[PDB]
Design a protein around this ligand. Structure first.
Ligand SMILES: *Cc1cc2c(cc1C)nc1c(=O)[nH]c(=O)nc-1n2C[C@H](O)[C@H](O)[C@H](O)COP(=O)(O)OP(=O)(O)OC[C@H]1O[C@@H](n2cnc3c(N)ncnc32)[C@H](O)[C@@H]1O
Ligand SMILES: *Cc1cc2c(cc1C)nc1c(=O)[nH]c(=O)nc-1n2C[C@H](O)[C@H](O)[C@H](O)COP(=O)(O)OP(=O)(O)OC[C@H]1O[C@@H](n2cnc3c(N)ncnc32)[C@H](O)[C@@H]1O
Ligand SMILES: C=CCc1ccc(O)c(OC)c1
Ligand SMILES: C=CCc1ccc(O)c(OC)c1
Lengths: 525, 525
């Protein structure tokens, strides 16, 4: 049928749509079923339809965002703000609440407002992609570098606002985010930090401004629609070298983590954000599943062995990058070589020492860790026909026993639900994201429903072991926020009071992070 | 006269006090004029008395804080929460609103709950002073170091909660704060980050947890009473060396800042938070005003020259610390010498090469920058009889012109109001605090009132040049928050709805950072 906002008639919605068209122009409101299918979750989860958009609106300016918000308030139309809407693995551009309108800020608000060489920052509109920014930096011959995630088509703004991560020293995007401009849920515009002081040049210099520090409350949040964002850019070091360490055994995970933490916590010699990818993760990047195993079932141990031998990779594959003058890079690599060399079967390769298929991932990490955005890692989705992923990412202490327990808990459930377990340990200073990508056939309703049920079990089971996810998909947001229920759901109750204060009509992205406004609370979604 | 909360009778206040005694014990509630005088602002601003506490309550469990907040809600008693209450230059323990009850959490909640060597963090109760933490690190022979402000008698928690600053690479206290436990304004307890997930080991490992990031909203805020807070501790490097660069001329400020920025933005070779102190600031630390000038009125040029000659300092004095193996320190120091050496009159001294009276500041900075707390800088308040200070701290871009333009704006007003202008530029990566201390005779109303009117003009004047302060005194919080009025006071209105949602009875520290709850708005308060 026609997809409508909850409790909005065909009559009110057509009226709301015409008002939208009056603000942004006829060409920049999408509302037909055929055109709207590009904005559904490319990696859908569950058998039944979920997260359907009623319309897509593409404003050009802050003021247009204001009027769109003002219209939504009058007609009770829920608004789902996105930038480039490439949140793939977490719902893409699809809104949490079926029937919501996508506000695609990125389509036409895509200008690089400023790139300041002296102070090393960028002021961006949501539409500026990692590729967009890299092209700017290269063309203007910049000494600065950006920090990208695995896929470069994302928004520097959009990624920050869901607290996504990169892999250079500037990997923590929210940390380096400096100032923003947001349209609050009833259409008022506000600037944070020094942007709040008229005429200040310090908007991108000093994050905090004066009084309570709000910026964080607009990340993984439904408290507004962001129209501008500042971020800090690191200067490109004079040289760099990337390396791979293959580890033969599954049980090697324990010592890898335990050896890694002393080398990582002081940001030297492990300067970048190290990643520890399993053989499944790496194999999927360069090959199809059917190359190794033709059956329907958890892959047998001999099949795993073929992947390792043929790709010349270990069960665990450590990828790092070193920066600075060659002598410093030499000393740091020397230290890494001999800390990790204490593990039987460890083998060491630099980005200059491997041109084979197996070294494709090392060559890609070398680009990502040097602020060169890539799409090469889209090849993962060729693992199986109509390939999709969901991201189940629990946060772990950098401890080999915690890491082993998590590895074994997840592989256990993946085998049960007949999904390949692909893992990438992203290592911060004192914490670790255990990235589990589950790749499945999107066109097969049982794969979708198996993915949904399996991850709901893993959310619950991880919680009973004392682990939470940093970020999750539309389908798991209620299940994930339910796990942060210390003091009888104290945190959700806190977020609920603020959402109802700023958004009294419950307009902005209802259900985001399991945070529902009053008019939707207890309403079976 | 007995000091009472606004609109609360003696009978109703006596009842509230007795209820407080039933919770904390009668010996931990102070309500008599004589005992309350210790809790006045030690550095009072303006002639008329202001910021008078009605009572002081010292709970020693979260459970007691909850009960006290619930009582305050019943009786409409305003609560001002403090840790050690040593916020000197900004009001000390004194509440913004006259009549408020101080909740001194630090008196009895003063336990180090954990210090973890492996992950390098501490979980602290508000009462733990920098001296307390240092003592612990030393007793247990820890490899970690803390990051303290200039005065070590404050709270690690309390300092963080006002976004205070230290001078080690971990100088950004809020940045390294990881998890907290807060009592919300109606008595409910909440844990943030991974603390919100029951049984998680990652509370002090991963700050963000899931969904919106709230921790910042409890800094320079009146949204609750913090009972526990995590902070990361940096590993003590193998060696360190501290240095002083004296610059002879006032006008040298420009080239110093311009030369500093390239050396600072990459955290090397300026690894430390550098401070640039003027000859007044350093003179005050080791000598009284009457050693140079027994006159009344701004200090003459020959007196300024005598200070420089006698202390063997310049007008501007640069104080840095270098960390790591001696070869690394030696190369960094080499770079700093020929960069700054381009300024005519620059001179260099290491902490090992100066034991004269002028080098006390250098010896004190060497302590502070290595995580060794100090009170040596209390000598600053002997400048004049009954000395107190206020902190006027505008944020400045690391631009020589901008630093210069501020320097003259402030000195201009200081001379007009017959206050000596003492400056310490604290230099972050891409931003500087222009710390302006005004030292004055707290015992004469003219001096107090001259300080109040001068800092009001300097707030207003700095705003018209596009500069805002990062932190301010009780007396200036409305004037300061008034300057951040982009979008027609957009920022304050946002804060106000959050305060009103979480605090419908307007209990917690009304007027903090110029943020008043409903019942006080437009009330000459
Ligand atoms: C499939 C996949 C995904 C992936 C990845 C590898 C693969 C194979 N590697 C990632 C990585 O290394 N790091 C990372 O952070 N994410 C990674 N992903 C996930 C995803 O592809 C990327 O994170 C991607 O960059 C996110 O998409 P995009 O950048 O386009 O973000 P968005 O969809 O526009 O917005 C994300 C959410 O933020 C909120 N939002 C966005 N804009 C606004 C505005 N203007 N106002 C308010 N809220 C906004 C919304 O919640 C939105 O959904
Ligand atoms: C006079 C002076 C001051 C000074 C300084 C040098 C001199 C000569 N050098 C400083 C420095 O280098 N860095 C810095 O950050 N401050 C410096 N100061 C100022 C002062 O000495 C310190 O900032 C001091 O550490 C602050 O006092 P303290 O640490 O005792 O903080 P507090 O009074 O306990 O609390 C501060 C405010 O935070 C809120 N607060 C505190 N505790 C709580 C709890 N538990 N819950 C909720 N809110 C809390 C209040 O708003 C309180 O006013
Ligand atoms: C190959 C890395 C994938 C990846 C990294 C971080 C993420 O948050 C994520 O979410 C879907 C996926
Ligand atoms: C002598 C340094 C003083 C100092 C440093 C940081 C501050 O915030 C401050 O405020 C009063 C004072």
């Amino acid at each position: 049928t026609r997809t409508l906002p909850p409790g909005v008639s065909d009559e009110r919605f057509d009226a709301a749509l015409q008002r939208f068209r009056d603000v942004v122009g006829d060409k920049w409101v999408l509302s037909t079923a055929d055109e709207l299918e590009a904005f559904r979750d490319p990696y859908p989860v569950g058998a039944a339809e979920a997260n359907l958009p009623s319309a897509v609106v593409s404003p050009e300016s802050t003021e247009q965002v204001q009027d769109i918000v003002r219209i939504a308030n009058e007609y009770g139309i829920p608004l789902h703000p996105v930038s480039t809407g490439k949140n793939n693995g977490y719902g893409g551009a699809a809104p949490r609440l079926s029937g919501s309108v996508i506000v695609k800020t990125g389509e036409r608000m895509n200008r690089i407002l400023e790139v300041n060489e002296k102070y090393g920052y960028a002021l961006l509109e949501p539409g500026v992609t990692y590729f967009d920014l890299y092209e700017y930096l290269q063309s203007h011959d910049s000494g600065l570098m950006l920090d990208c995630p695995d896929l470069g088509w994302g928004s520097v703004v959009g990624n920050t606002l869901d607290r996504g991560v990169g892999y250079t020293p500037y990997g923590d995007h929210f940390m380096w985010q400096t100032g923003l401009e947001v349209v609050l849920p009833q259409g008022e515009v506000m600037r944070t930090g020094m942007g709040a002081l008229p005429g200040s040049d310090a908007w991108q210099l000093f994050p905090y401004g004066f009084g309570p520090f709000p910026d964080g409350m607009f990340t993984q949040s439904n408290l507004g629609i962001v129209t501008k964002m500042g971020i800090a850019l690191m200067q490109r070091p004079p040289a760099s070298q990337s390396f791979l360490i293959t580890f033969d055994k599954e049980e090697d995970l324990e010592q890898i983590v335990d050896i890694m933490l002393p080398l990582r916590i002081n940001m030297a010699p492990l300067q970048n954000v190290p990643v520890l990818r399993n053989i499944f993760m790496d194999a999927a990047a360069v090959s199809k599943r059917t190359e190794w195993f033709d059956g329907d079932g958890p892959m047998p141990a001999e099949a795993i062995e073929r992947m390792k031998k043929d790709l010349d990779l270990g069960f665990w594959n450590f990828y790092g990058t070193l920066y600075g003058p060659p002598p410093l890079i030499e000393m740091y690599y020397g230290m890494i070589k001999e800390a990790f060399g204490k593990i039987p079967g460890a083998r060491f390769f630099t980005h200059e020492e491997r041109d084979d298929r197996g070294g494709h991932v090392l060559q890609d990490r070398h680009k990502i860790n040097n602020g060169i955005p890539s799409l090469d890692e889209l090849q993962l989705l060729d693992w199986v026909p109509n390939g999709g992923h969901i991201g189940f990412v629990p946060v772990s202490a950098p401890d080999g026993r915690e890491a082993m327990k998590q590895f074994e808990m997840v592989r256990n459930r993946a085998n049960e639900y007949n999904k390949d377990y692909m893992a990438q340990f992203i290592i911060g200073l004192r914490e670790m994201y255990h990235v589990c990508l589950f790749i499945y056939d999107t066109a097969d309703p049982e794969a979708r429903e198996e993915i949904l049920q399996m991850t709901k079990v893993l959310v619950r089971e991880a919680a009973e072991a004392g682990y939470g996810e940093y970020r999750t998909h539309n389908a798991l947001m209620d299940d994930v926020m339910a796990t942060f229920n210390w003091g009888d759901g104290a945190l959700l109750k806190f977020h609920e009071k603020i959402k109802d204060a700023l958004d009294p009509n419950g307009i902005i992205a209802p259900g985001k992070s399991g945070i529902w406004p009053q008019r939707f609370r207890g309403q079976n979604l």
